Amino acid sequence: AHKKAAGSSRNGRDSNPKMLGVKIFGGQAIVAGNIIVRQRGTEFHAGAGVGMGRDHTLFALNDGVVKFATKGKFNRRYVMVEEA
Amino acid sequence: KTMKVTQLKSGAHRLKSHKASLKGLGLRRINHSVVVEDTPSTRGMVNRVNYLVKVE
RNA sequence: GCUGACGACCAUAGCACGAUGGCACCACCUGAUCCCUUCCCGAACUCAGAAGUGAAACAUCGUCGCGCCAAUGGUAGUGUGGUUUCGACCAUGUGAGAGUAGGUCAUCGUCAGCU
RNA sequence: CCUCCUAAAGAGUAACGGAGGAGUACGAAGGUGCGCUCAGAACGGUCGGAAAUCGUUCAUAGAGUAUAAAGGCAAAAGCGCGCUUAACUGCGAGACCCACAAGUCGAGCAGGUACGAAAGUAGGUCUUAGUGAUCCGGUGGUUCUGUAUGGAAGGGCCAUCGCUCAACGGAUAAAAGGUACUCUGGGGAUAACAGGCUGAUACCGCCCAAGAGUUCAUAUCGACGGCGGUGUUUGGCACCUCGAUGUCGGCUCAUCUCAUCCUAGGGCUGAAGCAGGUCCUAAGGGUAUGGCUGUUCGCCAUUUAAAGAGGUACGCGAGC
RNA sequence: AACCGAUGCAAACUCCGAAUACCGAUGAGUAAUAUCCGGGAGACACACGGCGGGUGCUAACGUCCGUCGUGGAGAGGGAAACAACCCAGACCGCCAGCUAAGGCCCCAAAUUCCUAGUUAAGUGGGAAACGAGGUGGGAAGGCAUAGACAGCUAGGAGGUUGGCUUAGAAGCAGCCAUCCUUUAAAGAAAGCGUAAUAGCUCACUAGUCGAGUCGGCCUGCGCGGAAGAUGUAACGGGGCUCAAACUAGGAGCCGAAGCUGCGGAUUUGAAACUUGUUUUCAAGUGGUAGGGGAGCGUUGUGUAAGCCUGUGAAGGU
RNA sequence: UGAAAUAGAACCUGAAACCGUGUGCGUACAAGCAGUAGGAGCCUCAAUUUAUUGGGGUGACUGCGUACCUUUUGUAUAAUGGGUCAGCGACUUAUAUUCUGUAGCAAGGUUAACCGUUUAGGGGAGCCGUAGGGAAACCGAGUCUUAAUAGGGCGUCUAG
């Protein structure tokens, strides 16, 4: 192993996937209880008709059509369920 | 109105959607000519496989 | 015409600088008995009020100094088919970011009050 | 098991790929109501400074968030105070994820509360790690069963306890080695020889020219660097052969290459001559014997015009 | 150190930010669809060529992912020969035709085809940095009958051996200026030379001759760099030079098991004398593991106390 | 002698591998899985008014063409196995169970051991189906969980 410069560097572990992201995209029909976004933190915020879980999960409080918009003074990404 | 479409090259080794664009027009083999309505929906099938087909 | 409340929108709306406003409204303001306040403090909160003042704040107006927004064109990338010396190139369809010309001192809704 | 990247803008995605954490903590660090805003910099001020505490001006987080990282966080999820136990019970429409077993989110309903004046909020904590099936055994409850009958024992149901079962889907409650004395079934799925691919490394050549050469880069040599050729060293891979391709060296017998050791022909020379040094051409021939060591090699002795470098299964054991 | 201004870079940086891909909606046309339930499996050694990466050396016919195509399990034509590359998916038969990739001088089917050029290296038909006055073309330039480039003749000088440094540094080891004078011109010198001088050139000027010339840039195709082992041996071969090479066009033709033509079989579905009762039509018919369907033959039993058989059974050939 | 004697005692039949003899054709200038598609010549039979076809044998010459099996990502492979021939040689049987087809009966179907003068006839013990829920008691088109009549789980509204 001339120059002898190699050697073990133990960093060969990782965690399992979490399957996060948008589950139902804009303009889709949705029923109450359907999960819309699984996320870490509030990447998207719960608008009218959308609830927020302890996991930060966004779900439909009532049936309708899911809609995405950037609203508010913070330019936050909101998800709403419009009664349509 | 309609249009005449003819397959010049084989569609046997193409992408899955290019294969299904040939089958969406009614083309089954090389040098097979079909008549099909000239609408933007059917012309977009021709667009997807323009290297394969020829519109008379 | 202006003021206040609550909204839409979330910088072309902000920042900065200057000017205007006290009849209403607002704000400072007086006082601390009372309700209520302070790990101390009537500072904030709360009350009782009207001597003073638009100084601050606030609102409105003005501007390009900043910030923000922003083309046209070109370039980069790229789906598909082909070619390649593997860098890329051709056909077709897309097409940025940066930068430039330029724009900007917002725009509306409901209600109430003075005029 | 968790976080980031690899991961190719949905999910997922491997490597003995690059980086880090976990096997906890907390009856408040949970719930609610109310209230608050940080890190820094500068100025002024007793000890007291660079920085303790105080006052002032800027100050969308340059701080904090119990714990790594990512994503979040002003209605603060950050920081205090009062009262508290929702860190409830029975559930749960509907979804995410998923081979299964599992895991995740969840409005709403009923009962009993906690805080709030109330609308309300609360089924633990900003989230994602903090974990382990079944069997068996224990404990708290229960009318379910109760081997003739009444009991009881035992069992069932509900709740809970006992795992570095950490090789973490856990083979048993219970477990190390040696074999050159070995053996069987297989594999060129997988190593050692040789071939193949590759050429990092090696060897050889070229480019540049700092310099050495008393002067003078280029007679000769070529620092720092650059570009190739060969298969030729040390390697990388595992493509061929494990129902067998014999290992090194010697002997015998070779065959080829040229990057030429001698002899032959040349240019330059720091070539006076004699001898050389480089480079070009050239493969026709030739190119030792010994001491040591199994050696190839290497050192040494004595020669020779010279004692070449290599390929040939590191040529050649159905030739020794 | 910072702070300002120019200026780069980053998988675990992002003020930004596609194309695709993915999740939905609506709508035509085309399509042997999608989904669910059950019987039977096989497979869980993959490989190469692209594309995006990690690893390795942007090494490997390496390795590990993602994604596509092909092979696996796929014949045919082309790539000389060549599972994985290109064209193309073999039901069977034909001494019919058109084409794809690739090709058309001969081996060997089809152009010694046409037009305009390039190459002189057999480049084509291996190989780089780098070198060169090969050759063609294109944008510009400088100079020129007020005699241009080259040659030849003459001069190329004086302060001064510039100062310093140095043994020596005298144009010419090296460091700091680039000055002035006779000038038509002559550098405080671009080389050779000397220990230093000396010496020979050059730049530059005048003369002679007389017409175009000089040097950079870009583009195409060439040249050198270029040395290996059984034998040419790095176009498959022959051979090829106004090509039989290359570039840009054009027209023919050859060329496959592709397509069409003719005949025949077969699977599935479709209108009916309706179970193959008949005539057709449409789409199909490569195939390993494997799943499904339909049959052939052999020995024996009943049919069979039959039928056949010495006018010759079985078996053999 | 015998019907037969290539039925003659190694005796029925007498295959193949393998070995001879005879006839016809080809073969001593040409490179390879030995064939295949063409194809001249020669030889031999049957017709035919006489070389014209047809059948048979041979195969000069041309094109194409690297056995089979196994195992593999991939084999002409210089990977395995086989010298050849003949004969033999590997998915069975018993029971249970599930699905499919078919037949009989059909809200029913069917008997087993046995007896029997025995494939009949008898034998209904048993099994499957027709009801599920719940650990179970228990209830039943409902039932379980629950304080709940709410919610939810599992069932329901025939063919065996």
JSON list of N, CA, C and O (backbone and C1' of nucleotides) in Angstrom, two decimals, chain D residues 272-287:
[
{"chain": "D", "resi": 272, "resn": "A", "atom": "P", "xyz": [40.41, 18.17, -29.37]},
{"chain": "D", "resi": 272, "resn": "A", "atom": "O5'", "xyz": [41.62, 18.23, -30.39]},
{"chain": "D", "resi": 272, "resn": "A", "atom": "C5'", "xyz": [41.48, 18.82, -31.67]},
{"chain": "D", "resi": 272, "resn": "A", "atom": "C4'", "xyz": [42.68, 18.55, -32.54]},
{"chain": "D", "resi": 272, "resn": "A", "atom": "C3'", "xyz": [43.05, 17.08, -32.70]},
{"chain": "D", "resi": 272, "resn": "A", "atom": "O3'", "xyz": [42.33, 16.46, -33.75]},
{"chain": "D", "resi": 272, "resn": "A", "atom": "C1'", "xyz": [44.97, 18.31, -32.07]},
{"chain": "D", "resi": 273, "resn": "G", "atom": "P", "xyz": [41.74, 14.98, -33.58]},
{"chain": "D", "resi": 273, "resn": "G", "atom": "O5'", "xyz": [43.03, 14.06, -33.49]},
{"chain": "D", "resi": 273, "resn": "G", "atom": "C5'", "xyz": [43.92, 13.91, -34.59]},
{"chain": "D", "resi": 273, "resn": "G", "atom": "C4'", "xyz": [45.12, 13.10, -34.19]},
{"chain": "D", "resi": 273, "resn": "G", "atom": "C3'", "xyz": [44.82, 11.76, -33.55]},
{"chain": "D", "resi": 273, "resn": "G", "atom": "O3'", "xyz": [44.59, 10.74, -34.50]},
{"chain": "D", "resi": 273, "resn": "G", "atom": "C1'", "xyz": [46.40, 12.93, -32.24]},
{"chain": "D", "resi": 274, "resn": "C", "atom": "P", "xyz": [43.36, 9.73, -34.32]},
{"chain": "D", "resi": 274, "resn": "C", "atom": "O5'", "xyz": [43.77, 8.86, -33.05]},
{"chain": "D", "resi": 274, "resn": "C", "atom": "C5'", "xyz": [44.98, 8.12, -33.03]},
{"chain": "D", "resi": 274, "resn": "C", "atom": "C4'", "xyz": [45.27, 7.59, -31.65]},
{"chain": "D", "resi": 274, "resn": "C", "atom": "C3'", "xyz": [44.09, 6.93, -30.96]},
{"chain": "D", "resi": 274, "resn": "C", "atom": "O3'", "xyz": [43.91, 5.59, -31.35]},
{"chain": "D", "resi": 274, "resn": "C", "atom": "C1'", "xyz": [45.12, 8.47, -29.48]},
{"chain": "D", "resi": 275, "resn": "A", "atom": "P", "xyz": [42.45, 4.94, -31.33]},
{"chain": "D", "resi": 275, "resn": "A", "atom": "O5'", "xyz": [42.18, 4.69, -29.78]},
{"chain": "D", "resi": 275, "resn": "A", "atom": "C5'", "xyz": [40.89, 4.87, -29.24]},
{"chain": "D", "resi": 275, "resn": "A", "atom": "C4'", "xyz": [40.95, 5.49, -27.86]},
{"chain": "D", "resi": 275, "resn": "A", "atom": "C3'", "xyz": [39.60, 5.84, -27.27]},
{"chain": "D", "resi": 275, "resn": "A", "atom": "O3'", "xyz": [38.95, 4.74, -26.67]},
{"chain": "D", "resi": 275, "resn": "A", "atom": "C1'", "xyz": [41.01, 7.71, -27.10]},
{"chain": "D", "resi": 276, "resn": "G", "atom": "P", "xyz": [37.64, 4.13, -27.35]},
{"chain": "D", "resi": 276, "resn": "G", "atom": "O5'", "xyz": [36.77, 5.42, -27.70]},
{"chain": "D", "resi": 276, "resn": "G", "atom": "C5'", "xyz": [35.56, 5.69, -27.01]},
{"chain": "D", "resi": 276, "resn": "G", "atom": "C4'", "xyz": [35.70, 6.86, -26.07]},
{"chain": "D", "resi": 276, "resn": "G", "atom": "C3'", "xyz": [34.42, 7.62, -25.77]},
{"chain": "D", "resi": 276, "resn": "G", "atom": "O3'", "xyz": [33.63, 6.98, -24.78]},
{"chain": "D", "resi": 276, "resn": "G", "atom": "C1'", "xyz": [36.14, 9.15, -26.28]},
{"chain": "D", "resi": 277, "resn": "G", "atom": "P", "xyz": [32.10, 6.62, -25.09]},
{"chain": "D", "resi": 277, "resn": "G", "atom": "O5'", "xyz": [31.33, 7.98, -24.82]},
{"chain": "D", "resi": 277, "resn": "G", "atom": "C5'", "xyz": [31.72, 8.85, -23.76]},
{"chain": "D", "resi": 277, "resn": "G", "atom": "C4'", "xyz": [31.01, 10.17, -23.89]},
{"chain": "D", "resi": 277, "resn": "G", "atom": "C3'", "xyz": [29.63, 10.08, -24.49]},
{"chain": "D", "resi": 277, "resn": "G", "atom": "O3'", "xyz": [28.67, 9.73, -23.51]},
{"chain": "D", "resi": 277, "resn": "G", "atom": "C1'", "xyz": [30.84, 11.83, -25.53]},
{"chain": "D", "resi": 278, "resn": "U", "atom": "P", "xyz": [27.29, 9.04, -23.93]},
{"chain": "D", "resi": 278, "resn": "U", "atom": "O5'", "xyz": [26.35, 10.28, -24.21]},
{"chain": "D", "resi": 278, "resn": "U", "atom": "C5'", "xyz": [25.25, 10.17, -25.08]},
{"chain": "D", "resi": 278, "resn": "U", "atom": "C4'", "xyz": [25.07, 11.40, -25.92]},
{"chain": "D", "resi": 278, "resn": "U", "atom": "C3'", "xyz": [24.23, 11.21, -27.16]},
{"chain": "D", "resi": 278, "resn": "U", "atom": "O3'", "xyz": [22.85, 11.22, -26.87]},
{"chain": "D", "resi": 278, "resn": "U", "atom": "C1'", "xyz": [26.18, 12.39, -27.73]},
{"chain": "D", "resi": 279, "resn": "C", "atom": "P", "xyz": [21.99, 9.88, -27.03]},
{"chain": "D", "resi": 279, "resn": "C", "atom": "O5'", "xyz": [21.30, 10.06, -28.44]},
{"chain": "D", "resi": 279, "resn": "C", "atom": "C5'", "xyz": [20.68, 11.30, -28.78]},
{"chain": "D", "resi": 279, "resn": "C", "atom": "C4'", "xyz": [20.95, 11.69, -30.20]},
{"chain": "D", "resi": 279, "resn": "C", "atom": "C3'", "xyz": [20.68, 10.64, -31.26]},
{"chain": "D", "resi": 279, "resn": "C", "atom": "O3'", "xyz": [19.30, 10.46, -31.53]},
{"chain": "D", "resi": 279, "resn": "C", "atom": "C1'", "xyz": [22.71, 11.72, -31.74]},
{"chain": "D", "resi": 280, "resn": "C", "atom": "P", "xyz": [18.77, 9.04, -32.04]},
{"chain": "D", "resi": 280, "resn": "C", "atom": "O5'", "xyz": [19.14, 9.02, -33.58]},
{"chain": "D", "resi": 280, "resn": "C", "atom": "C5'", "xyz": [18.60, 9.98, -34.46]},
{"chain": "D", "resi": 280, "resn": "C", "atom": "C4'", "xyz": [19.21, 9.92, -35.83]},
{"chain": "D", "resi": 280, "resn": "C", "atom": "C3'", "xyz": [19.18, 8.57, -36.52]},
{"chain": "D", "resi": 280, "resn": "C", "atom": "O3'", "xyz": [17.92, 8.25, -37.07]},
{"chain": "D", "resi": 280, "resn": "C", "atom": "C1'", "xyz": [21.31, 9.54, -36.79]},
{"chain": "D", "resi": 281, "resn": "U", "atom": "P", "xyz": [17.36, 6.76, -36.97]},
{"chain": "D", "resi": 281, "resn": "U", "atom": "O5'", "xyz": [18.18, 5.97, -38.08]},
{"chain": "D", "resi": 281, "resn": "U", "atom": "C5'", "xyz": [18.27, 6.46, -39.40]},
{"chain": "D", "resi": 281, "resn": "U", "atom": "C4'", "xyz": [19.30, 5.71, -40.20]},
{"chain": "D", "resi": 281, "resn": "U", "atom": "C3'", "xyz": [19.28, 4.20, -40.07]},
{"chain": "D", "resi": 281, "resn": "U", "atom": "O3'", "xyz": [18.24, 3.59, -40.81]},
{"chain": "D", "resi": 281, "resn": "U", "atom": "C1'", "xyz": [21.51, 4.98, -40.02]},
{"chain": "D", "resi": 282, "resn": "A", "atom": "P", "xyz": [17.40, 2.39, -40.17]},
{"chain": "D", "resi": 282, "resn": "A", "atom": "O5'", "xyz": [18.40, 1.15, -40.20]},
{"chain": "D", "resi": 282, "resn": "A", "atom": "C5'", "xyz": [19.14, 0.84, -41.37]},
{"chain": "D", "resi": 282, "resn": "A", "atom": "C4'", "xyz": [20.35, 0.01, -41.04]},
{"chain": "D", "resi": 282, "resn": "A", "atom": "C3'", "xyz": [20.09, -1.18, -40.14]},
{"chain": "D", "resi": 282, "resn": "A", "atom": "O3'", "xyz": [19.54, -2.27, -40.85]},
{"chain": "D", "resi": 282, "resn": "A", "atom": "C1'", "xyz": [22.03, -0.04, -39.41]},
{"chain": "D", "resi": 283, "resn": "A", "atom": "P", "xyz": [18.38, -3.15, -40.17]},
{"chain": "D", "resi": 283, "resn": "A", "atom": "O5'", "xyz": [19.19, -4.05, -39.14]},
{"chain": "D", "resi": 283, "resn": "A", "atom": "C5'", "xyz": [20.24, -4.89, -39.58]},
{"chain": "D", "resi": 283, "resn": "A", "atom": "C4'", "xyz": [20.17, -6.23, -38.91]},
{"chain": "D", "resi": 283, "resn": "A", "atom": "C3'", "xyz": [18.82, -6.93, -39.03]},
{"chain": "D", "resi": 283, "resn": "A", "atom": "O3'", "xyz": [19.03, -8.34, -39.11]},
{"chain": "D", "resi": 283, "resn": "A", "atom": "C1'", "xyz": [19.32, -6.53, -36.74]},
{"chain": "D", "resi": 284, "resn": "G", "atom": "P", "xyz": [18.98, -9.07, -40.54]},
{"chain": "D", "resi": 284, "resn": "G", "atom": "O5'", "xyz": [20.49, -9.01, -41.04]},
{"chain": "D", "resi": 284, "resn": "G", "atom": "C5'", "xyz": [20.89, -9.67, -42.24]},
{"chain": "D", "resi": 284, "resn": "G", "atom": "C4'", "xyz": [22.28, -10.21, -42.13]},
{"chain": "D", "resi": 284, "resn": "G", "atom": "C3'", "xyz": [22.61, -10.95, -40.85]},
{"chain": "D", "resi": 284, "resn": "G", "atom": "O3'", "xyz": [22.12, -12.28, -40.85]},
{"chain": "D", "resi": 284, "resn": "G", "atom": "C1'", "xyz": [24.36, -9.44, -41.35]},
{"chain": "D", "resi": 285, "resn": "G", "atom": "P", "xyz": [22.29, -13.21, -39.55]},
{"chain": "D", "resi": 285, "resn": "G", "atom": "O5'", "xyz": [23.75, -13.80, -39.71]},
{"chain": "D", "resi": 285, "resn": "G", "atom": "C5'", "xyz": [24.40, -14.43, -38.63]},
{"chain": "D", "resi": 285, "resn": "G", "atom": "C4'", "xyz": [25.84, -14.01, -38.52]},
{"chain": "D", "resi": 285, "resn": "G", "atom": "C3'", "xyz": [26.39, -14.02, -37.11]},
{"chain": "D", "resi": 285, "resn": "G", "atom": "O3'", "xyz": [26.75, -15.32, -36.68]},
{"chain": "D", "resi": 285, "resn": "G", "atom": "C1'", "xyz": [26.96, -11.99, -38.14]},
{"chain": "D", "resi": 286, "resn": "G", "atom": "P", "xyz": [26.11, -15.90, -35.33]},
{"chain": "D", "resi": 286, "resn": "G", "atom": "O5'", "xyz": [27.14, -15.44, -34.22]},
{"chain": "D", "resi": 286, "resn": "G", "atom": "C5'", "xyz": [28.53, -15.42, -34.49]},
{"chain": "D", "resi": 286, "resn": "G", "atom": "C4'", "xyz": [29.23, -14.35, -33.70]},
{"chain": "D", "resi": 286, "resn": "G", "atom": "C3'", "xyz": [28.89, -14.27, -32.23]},
{"chain": "D", "resi": 286, "resn": "G", "atom": "O3'", "xyz": [29.52, -15.27, -31.46]},
{"chain": "D", "resi": 286, "resn": "G", "atom": "C1'", "xyz": [28.91, -12.11, -33.14]},
{"chain": "D", "resi": 287, "resn": "U", "atom": "P", "xyz": [28.71, -15.98, -30.27]},
{"chain": "D", "resi": 287, "resn": "U", "atom": "O5'", "xyz": [28.60, -14.85, -29.15]},
{"chain": "D", "resi": 287, "resn": "U", "atom": "C5'", "xyz": [29.76, -14.21, -28.63]},
{"chain": "D", "resi": 287, "resn": "U", "atom": "C4'", "xyz": [29.45, -12.87, -28.03]},
{"chain": "D", "resi": 287, "resn": "U", "atom": "C3'", "xyz": [28.52, -12.85, -26.83]},
{"chain": "D", "resi": 287, "resn": "U", "atom": "O3'", "xyz": [29.18, -13.19, -25.63]},
{"chain": "D", "resi": 287, "resn": "U", "atom": "C1'", "xyz": [27.89, -11.15, -28.33]}
]
